[PDB]
Amino acid sequence: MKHRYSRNRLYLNPKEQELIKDYPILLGGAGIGSIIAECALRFGFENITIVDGDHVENSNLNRQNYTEGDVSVNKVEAIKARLKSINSKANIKIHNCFLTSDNVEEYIKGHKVAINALDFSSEVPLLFDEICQKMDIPVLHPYNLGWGGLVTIISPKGLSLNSIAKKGEKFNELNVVEYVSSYMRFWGKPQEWLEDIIYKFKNEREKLSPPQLSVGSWVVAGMCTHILFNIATQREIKSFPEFYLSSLEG
Amino acid sequence: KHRYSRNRLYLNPKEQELIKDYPILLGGAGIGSIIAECALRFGFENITIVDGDHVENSNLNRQNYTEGDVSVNKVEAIKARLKSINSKANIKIHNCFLTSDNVEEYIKGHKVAINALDFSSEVPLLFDEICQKMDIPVLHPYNLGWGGLVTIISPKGLSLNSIAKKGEKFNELNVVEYVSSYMRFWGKPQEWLEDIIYKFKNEREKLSPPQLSVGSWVVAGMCTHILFNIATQREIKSFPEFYLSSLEG
């Protein structure tokens, strides 16, 4: 440990603190992932690769780890500045590029765990997971459900998100969230708030991106940091088709 | 504005308008510095922050500060951070410790308050008492490592005094022991929470309780939601009820 991680004691012993220091994490996408990166860095994960090709837009400022001065800059450049001002000795490696079928494997290679925060409009969201399973790299899928944070982990030998994808039609986050609500309702725990926002979003006249709130981003960042700690320290986790849902209502 | 574009459906324009000016008083810029950013990005642009401490190294594992902030007043550092997120936001700071003499005037003028005050200061319980008198509900956020804990003292309800015993001093360990005992009594024991309580008590040296970034980030989300519910007059649980949020729900 260090005096920076002084208040981590009892929860983490010194050997765990050292372990997560160099534990190579791959983060694909610096949007929702920028909140996760700060929470995970402050926890003690100092070896983070961030890959994103987008620039900071105004609409990011309601839930992503950027400032007014960052607007029009590569998200990856801004989040590295933010992260390295929190920990100057941290090993924060960025790549201002979009992932494609040709480059995605070499980026994945060398990491012990990955966070798939990739827009489903790019080409590689599902292929990203397939390579990680092939390489024994578990994949965290964090989602911003407004009031809730949702994480599901694709484990190397388990079901992938394909299981809920339909053969022949495209797959996005609305499918994931509709699976979660149906699963919760199946078990007698309907999330009526979640079903309500899905209904409003689908019956929107105009075709827009899903709404997201700072609440869910902040909650999911904490969830991911806990999950990462469990994965690095070989504590048990729930794998997809099971998931973690956290909200004030719960 | 386009800054709140992705807030749609969850909030209508009139709610976004309402919380913009909803005056929040935040006592304590430690765990409160995480809460402040999440609430500002949500759309709460009228925040008063009162704290007398400086930024220390040990804050960096869970609080909203940088290596450059160390040795600076928390309120100046957190205001710089907040104003870099929103230049037009109304962030009023006071680098002062709260005392019996000043605490009422700070509370005056706010619709809701967040009590994140160290229990070694003079006014943690008096702060709530004054807020109760003035119809100001008070959020008490706690960092339970893996969990976020919030309880709201409502003006006409029980205060934290009810779990204090008149003969010994009262701190956050009493709140957490209350929460864990409540959970076990009602059939959902939090063995993780009891475990960290047990480890901390049997520590040789007397140190401050450990805290993690996860609970800070989770408690910041919970507080922002609770603020939105209070401001838009949606139902919330008041103390002796509470909200506990963790990876397992």
Ligand SMILES: CCCCCCCC(=O)N[C@@H]1CCCCNC1=O
């Ligand atoms: C109808 C309302 C619920 C919509 C749920 C979207 C939440 C979310 O997280 N979506 C994406 C998915 C791509 C990678 C991660 N980041 C994102 O922003």
Ligand SMILES: CCCCCCCC(=O)N[C@@H]1CCCCNC1=O
């Ligand atoms: C034994 C382990 C559990 C200890 C719980 C401490 C959590 C916490 O919140 N403590 C303080 C209390 C003062 C106001 C808010 N901020 C704080 O840091």
